[PDB]
From a paper:
As expected, OhLys has a typical GH22 lysozyme fold. The chain was traced from Glu1 through to Cys126, with a glycerol from the cryoprotectant, four Cl− ions and 200 water molecules. There are four disulphide bridges (Cys6–Cys126, Cys30–Cys114, Cys63–Cys79 and Cys75–Cys93) in the structure. The overall charge of OhLys differs somewhat from that of other C-type lysozymes. This increase in negative charge of OhLys is evident in the surface electrostatics of the enzyme. While the significance of this is not clear, it should be noted that the peptidoglycan substrate is also a charged molecule, and that peptidoglycan from different bacterial sources have different pI. So, charge interactions between the enzyme and the substrate at working pH are probably functionally important.
Numbering used by the authors: 1 to 126
Write the structure that this text describes.
């Protein structure tokens, strides 16, 4: 399903995302827009790894999909748990990734389309 922008804003605010590892709500909204386009079932199969769900979490380092060579399962979850309408597993796993990296550099979509920009538009009007 698609999680509307302002719904996602409220979900992340009510989960303590503002200030989390120095990040902002706008950072995460812009991240989602450029990674999954707000789709809980977003999916990219790059070949050596697959990315799952609203935060495009990676089967090489963070979730087990049973079909990625050279993998570790840093979030100790099946990737299929990141393809559901329930964002709890996504939130827990994304927080662990961002805590590991002390920020959002794991997400190229955020580096390329968000970092160092005016992100007002992502968080206004809710
Ligand atoms: Cl909730
Ligand atoms: Cl807040
Ligand atoms: Cl960051
Ligand atoms: Cl708001």
């Amino acid at each position: 399903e698609i999680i509307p922008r302002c719904e996602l804003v409220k979900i992340l605010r009510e989960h303590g995302f503002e200030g989390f590892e120095g990040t902002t709500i706008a950072d995460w909204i812009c991240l989602v827009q450029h990674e999954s386009d707000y789709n809980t079932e977003a999916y990219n199969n790059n070949g050596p790894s697959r990315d799952y769900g609203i935060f495009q979490i990676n089967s090489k380092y963070w979730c087990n999909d049973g079909k990625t060579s050279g993998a570790v399962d840093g979030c100790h979850i099946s990737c299929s748990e990141l393809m559901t309408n329930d964002l709890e597993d996504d939130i827990k796993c994304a927080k662990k990734i961002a805590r590991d990296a002390h920020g959002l550099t794991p997400w190229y979509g955020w580096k390329n389309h968000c970092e160092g920009r005016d992100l007002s538009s992502y968080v206004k009007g809710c």
